[PDB]
């Protein structure tokens, strides 16, 4: 992403786990957290510490650090709604975080989890979260999940959500990524091999997945809508979605709706020509 760094009036949430902001790739960076149910002290002995603050990082991570991030000017909302303890968190708790996000003022609400459905049905307190971001025009990129099945997580398969896919770094889809048919018409593919992010407690580690291609797509999305602000237009996280998918670049059915295209979106929206 060169030189773009991201205006600090677009906020991005992250709802994972507890992510250490005290990490020396954060120094610089203007994060907020936002307590929900669940604990928000990260541990270096955590599970969910160290899947949000790898996630955290992708995005947020400061220039010159050890891992710099897709936009790290961006303000960043840490949600957190993973936990460390072995308890599985509920689609409701999801839920929480998300109207949490929404009423802090997201533009964009990053979900690098989900749970795998038959059909991607979902519990009515998601459908209903999920719905207050498609009223409040607000984005939710979020993981299609790493089964490798031509099957469905939930939220990614939600409506308006943007769900993605992991590929290689020569642009092909991996084995381990879902590509059930809705993700055919609201996923993307984007980068999900050996990803740099922190650790909690320090150091860095390369992690694959679904999970750690989410947070990619998300920094880009902040980054367009910068750039609409930079316009002089009103961010309109829809419209960013819209223009990720229609610049997505073909690879069959686990291409999703296409390869992340960054310059492709970039080139869309400031040629006002997308159809």
Same mark, same amino acid.
């Given at each position: /992403? ?29 994060? +907020?957290?936002? #307590? ?11 599970? /969910?510490?160290?899947?949000? +603050? ?7 991570? !400061? ?8 936009? #790290?000017?961006?303000? &960043? ?12 968190? +509920? !689609? ?12 802090? &003022? ?17 519990? $009515? ?14 984005? @939710?990129?979020?993981?299609? &999940? ?11 398969? @939600? ?5 993605? $896919?992991? /590929? ?13 048919? +809705?993700?055919? !018409? ?13 650790? #909690? ?5 390369? @992690? ?6 989410? #947070? ?47 310059? $492709? ?8 020509? /997308?159809?």
């Amino acid at each position: /992403m060169g030189s773009l760094k991201g205006d600090h009036n677009i906020r991005v949430a992250i709802l994972d786990g507890p992510v250490d902001i005290a990490h020396p790739c954060f120094q610089g960076a203007d994060l +907020t957290v936002l #307590p929900t149910l669940a604990p928000t002290a990260a541990r270096s002995d955590g599970f /969910m510490s160290a899947h949000g +603050t790898h996630v955290a990082s992708i995005i947020f991570g !400061q220039p010159e650090t050890s891992v710099p991030g897709i936009a #790290p000017q961006c303000r &960043g909302l840490i949600v957190p709604i993973f936990s460390d303890d072995r308890r599985r968190i +509920t !689609q409701l708790d999801l839920a929480r975080g998300i109207e949490r996000a929404v009423n802090a &003022g997201a533009h964009i609400i990053n979900i690098s989890g989900g749970e795998l459905t038959d059909f991607g049905e979902a519990d $009515g307190w998601l459908e209903n979260a999920v719905s207050l971001c498609r009223q409040n025009n607000v984005l @939710l990129v979020a993981a299609a &999940g790493n089964n490798g099945c031509d099957c469905l997580h939930v939220p990614a398969a @939600l409506p308006a959500v943007l769900a993605v $896919g992991a /590929m290689d770094d020569h642009g092909h889809p991996l084995d381990f990524s879902n590509w059930g048919s +809705t993700y055919e !018409q609201q996923g993307i593919l984007a980068p999900g091999e050996d990803i740099l992010g922190a650790k #909690p407690g320090g150091g860095t580690e390369r @992690l694959s997945g679904t999970a750690f291609a989410t #947070p990619i797509v998300s920094g880009v999305a902040a980054l367009l809508l910068s750039e609409q602000v930079r316009r002089g237009e009103t961010p309109d996280p829809q419209k960013v979605r819209q223009l990720l998918l229609q610049s997505a670049l073909p690879c069959a059915r686990r291409c999703l709706a296409g390869r992340l295209n960054v310059s $492709g979106a970039f080139t869309l929206l400031k040629g006002g020509d /997308m159809s």
